[PDB]
Amino acid sequence: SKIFFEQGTYQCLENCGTVALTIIRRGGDLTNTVFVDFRTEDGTANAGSDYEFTEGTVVFKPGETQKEIRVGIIDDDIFEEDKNFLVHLSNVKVSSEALACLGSPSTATVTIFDDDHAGIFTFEEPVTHVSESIGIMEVKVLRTSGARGNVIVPYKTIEGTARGGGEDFEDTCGELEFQNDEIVKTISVKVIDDEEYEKNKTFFLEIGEPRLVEMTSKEEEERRIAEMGRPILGEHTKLEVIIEESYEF
Ligand SMILES: [Ca+2]
Ligand SMILES: [Ca+2]
Ligand SMILES: [Ca+2]
């Protein structure tokens, strides 16, 4: 009798390649032979660009309340904001081999989350404490908001009350190479033991501007939003390293 959409709202990723939506019959009749016509309407997302066209008929054989439809999701590499498109149910039968009914929701809203932000690069903490022991130390550099593309993130150590050159820490410079879909990377810095106490030895580890490696009204804002999917620095671009002393014994 009543036949409608499981979830009034769906969501997916642009690279999902496709998105499954489920339809149901509530009751008011048993079985069998009910089929529902579905089709996609455009929201802020358009067919042929953000997704694929999607119309067909769904057949209900006996003893079943669950059928799924699948809409193709078009993927490219151009950063976009979130966009939506609708899927409508219509023309219920009426086997004749009845009357209505629509049911609710007869339409679903699919949200396509984009996966082309080159990422925001940041340290996890503004300050870290480490003992003189432990020699080398691992420092994670994060890529958030997106993993798309090969990004190069430069870094270096800045001498504080703690001196480098082989006194307190061993100077380190270079650039981390973030592969596509890759998120985390560690920086190794050599902390050495002093025959000497001193106090609160502080030195810094900084990351520079990231950059990626080589190889109409709507279209304009579309290309402007695209320029916002480039690699940028995050909340913490500089790490202060405090060194704890002792414990002799
Ligand atoms: Ca898209
Ligand atoms: Ca994409
Ligand atoms: Ca895209």
Residue numbers in the entry: 372 to 468, 482 to 599, 619 to 652
Which sentences from the paper describe this structure?
In contrast, the eukaryotic NCX has evolved an allosteric Ca2+ regulatory element encoded by a large cytosolic domain (∼500 amino acids) between transmembrane helices 5 and 6 i.e. the repeated membrane motif, designated as f-loop. This large loop includes two Ca2+-binding regulatory domains (CBD1 and CBD2), connected by a short linker. High-resolution NMR and crystal structures of isolated CBD1 and CBD2 domains of eukaryotic NCX revealed four Ca2+ sites (Ca1-Ca4) on CBD1 and two Ca2+ sites (CaI-CaII) on CBD2. Different lines of evidence suggest that CBD2 interacts with CBD1 to modify the equilibrium and kinetic properties of the primary Ca2+ sensor (Ca3-Ca4 sites), either in isolated CBD12 or in intact NCX.
To test this working hypothesis, we crystallized and determined the crystal structure of a two-domain CBD12 tandem from the brain splice variant (NCX1.4). In order to crystallize the tandem, we employed a previously characterized mutant, E454K. (i) The E454K substitution replaces the Ca2+ ion at Ca1 site of CBD1, thus, stabilizing the protein’s structure through a charge compensation mechanism. The overall structure of CBD12-E454K shows two nearly identical CBD domains, each composed of an anti-parallel β-sandwich, with root mean square deviation (r.m.s.d for 109 Cα atoms) of 1.3 Å. In agreement with the previously published crystal structure of CBD1-E454K, our structure reveals three Ca2+ ions in CBD1 that correspond to Ca2, Ca3 and Ca4 in CBD1-WT. Notably, there is no indication for bound Ca2+ ions in CBD2 of our structure. We ascribe the lack of bound Ca2+ in CBD2 to crystal packing between symmetry mates. The interface involves mainly interactions of the CBD1 Ca2+ binding loops with the interdomain linker, the CBD2 flexible FG loop and the strictly conserved CBD2 BC loop. The first hydrophilic region includes a pivotal interdomain electrostatic network centered at R532 in CBD2. This arginine takes a conformation that forms bifurcated hydrogen-bonded and non-hydrogen-bonded salt-bridges with D499, D500 in CBD1 and D565 in CBD2.
